[PDB]
């Protein structure tokens, strides 16, 4: 197990434009196209990212290609972030994966609001961090996924994904 398998489980795979849980157009493995309500807008964004006239449909290879780019960008975002980097650097690999999943789902902006939790993470206070993270819109909106990620943060193992 690695970050890629993990996120593939959490996000699934759809080759056609679809609305995610918040109702934003998305495609592939969690690739958000746009938050605007125009499907055209979306299609336009899609074509821009793929480099062709997709007509709202992509292949599996294309989806995986967007996915590689997206994972990479998320890691890089963490490293470039002054408050996150040190937390991330302080943790083992499994827990790092958990943080990348959060940033991938909610962006640097959303993750940005887990300060308190990140403090406890840095201090290796797992149980507490886990409890603090559950107090969030994130957990209330997408509880099953949140739970998986929280257990992974808490335990440092992949048990939630087995």
Catalytic residues: 11, 20
Shortest Å distance, C-beta 125 to Cl ion: 25
- Taking the least distance from each CB to Cl ion, the nearer of 140 and 144 is 144
| Structure tokens belonging to residue 106 | 């909610």
Task: Tell me: is residue 117 an annotated ligand-binding position.
Answer: yes
Kindly state whether residue 97 participates in binding Cl ion, applying the rule CB under 5 A: no
- Taking the least distance from each CB to Cl ion, the nearer of 49 and 130 is 49
Shortest Å distance, C-beta 49 to Cl ion: 4
Task: Tell me: is residue 32 an annotated ligand-binding position.
Answer: yes
Binders in 132-151 for Cl ion, by CB under 5 A = 142, 144-145
Task: Tell me: is residue 38 an annotated ligand-binding position.
Answer: no
Site string for Cl ion, 17-56 (x = CB under 5 A): --------------------------------x-------
Shortest Å distance, C-beta 93 to Cl ion: 24
Give the torsion through C-alpha atoms of 135, 136, 139, 140, to 10 deg.
100
Give Cβ neighbours of residue 149 (< 8 Å, ≥ 6 apart): 10, 98, 101, 102, 160
Shortest Å distance, C-beta 123 to Cl ion: 28
Task: Tell me: is residue 132 an annotated ligand-binding position.
Answer: yes
* Nearest residue to 117 (alpha-carbon basis) of 105, 104, 130: 130
Is the Cβ–Cβ distance between 94 and 85 less than 8 Å?
A: no
d(CA 6, CA 8): 5
Using DSSP's 3-state secondary structure scheme, residue 67 falls into: helix
Is the Cβ–Cβ distance between 70 and 63 less than 8 Å?
A: no
> Which residues are annotated as part of the binding site for substrate?
32, 104, 117, 132
Residues that bind Cl ion (CB under 5 A): 49, 142, 144-145
């Amino acid at each position: 197990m690695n970050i890629f398998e993990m996120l593939r489980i959490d996000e699934g795979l759809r080759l056609k434009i679809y609305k995610d849980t918040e109702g934003y157009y998305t495609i592939g493995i969690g690739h958000l196209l746009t938050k605007s309500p125009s499907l055209n807008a979306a299609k336009s964004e899609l074509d821009k990212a793929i480099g062709r006239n997709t007509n709202g449909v992509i292949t599996k290879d294309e989806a995986e290609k967007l996915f590689n780019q997206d994972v990479d960008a998320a890691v890089r975002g963490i490293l470039r972030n002054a408050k996150m980097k040190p937390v991330y650097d302080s943790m083992d690999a499994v827990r790092r994966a958990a943080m990348i999943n959060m940033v991938f789902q909610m962006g640097e902006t959303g993750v940005a609001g887990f300060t308190n939790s990140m403090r406890m993470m840095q201090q290796k206070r797992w149980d507490e961090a886990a409890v603090n993270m559950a107090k969030s819109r994130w957990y209330n909106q997408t509880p099953n996924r949140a739970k998986r990620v929280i257990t992974t943060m808490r335990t440092g193992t992949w048990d939630a994904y087995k």
